[PDB]
Amino acid sequence: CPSVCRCDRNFVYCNERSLTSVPLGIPEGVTVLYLHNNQINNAGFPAELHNVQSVHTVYLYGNQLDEFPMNLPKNVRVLHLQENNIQTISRAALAQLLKLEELHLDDNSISTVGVEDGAFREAISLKLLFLSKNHLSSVPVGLPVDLQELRVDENRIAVISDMAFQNLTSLERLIVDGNLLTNKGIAEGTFSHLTKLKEFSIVRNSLSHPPPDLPGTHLIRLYLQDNQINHIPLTAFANLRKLERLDISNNQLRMLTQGVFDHLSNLKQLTARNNPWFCDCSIKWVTEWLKYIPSSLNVRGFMCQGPEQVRGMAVRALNMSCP
């Protein structure tokens, strides 16, 4: 055990000690390693730290790191690297942590150029990757096959390549919300091969319509909130039969095309709040759909914003003005 750093019940507590580098005196049989809330630099990691095989959980949050740390313990499953100033992600560093299952790179200055081509792909055991609040311009191409959750929210992402989600059949959750993403930015059939995907979130983005060619093999939740969606195509919600929760709130939708929720048989909840719904003969089907829909479906937000004669009233309570 180190001189300044304390150890209790096979847990190393180096946290809140203002350490410039990771200490040398790390015992052979330690469970969890705490090195958070310090001033540890990128060149403060000894080669002997990688030799320790007993450690599976390492905390390194709120440090002075600039790159992804090297010589980290070989058999680490959960790794926390949030609140620091990481900019560069190296292919060699992630090749060391072969048993890495969970990774947190939140609140950092990570860019597309900083991430080396196929750096994350090296981490073969990677199931959970949290790239929240970074300066990333696009989704990296070299991603792990065994990935189950990709949270790349609150970034500067505008484009998504067709090769970015290559071989990722095991991915269940994809959170790409709070980005500069557009429908032209996303490649044709980029999400199509995500068979095991259960949840999809793209809130606070600039999409003119929902993403085309989405798989409904295991998709349950679809979030299209706070977007610039003006229209929804007839084939968009089609082939998504297993969907339960849907959200189209806070968009620029004027009306909905007849037979859009026709294929959604397992639907349970729908939200369309803060949308400029123009109540005319275009929403006649919406009124009839809401009248015959079972109580199992929770539909909210269908209110008239125009014209003034219909304004304020709910679409479900309407009667028509036209044939």
Curated annotation (Swiss-Prot):
- Provide the LRRCT domain boundaries: 275-323
* Locations listed in the record: Cell membrane; Endoplasmic reticulum membrane; Cell junction, Focal adhesion; Secreted, Extracellular space, Extracellular matrix
Taxonomic superkingdom: Eukaryota
Expressed, tissue-wise, as follows: Detected in adult brain (at protein level).
Q: Enumerate the glycosylated residues.
A: N167
- What switches on its expression? Up-regulated by FGF2.
| Protein function | Functions in cell-cell adhesion, cell migration and axon guidance. Mediates cell-cell adhesion via its interactions with ADGRL3 and probably also other latrophilins that are expressed at the surface of adjacent cells. May play a role in the migration of cortical neurons during brain development via its interaction with UNC5D. Mediates axon growth cone collapse and plays a repulsive role in neuron guidance via its interaction with UNC5D, and possibly also other UNC-5 family members. Plays a role in fibroblast growth factor-mediated signaling cascades.
Its name, as the record gives it, is Leucine-rich repeat transmembrane protein FLRT2
Q: What species was this sequence derived from?
A: Mus musculus
The gene for this chain is Flrt2
First and last residues shown, out of full length: 36 to 361 of 660
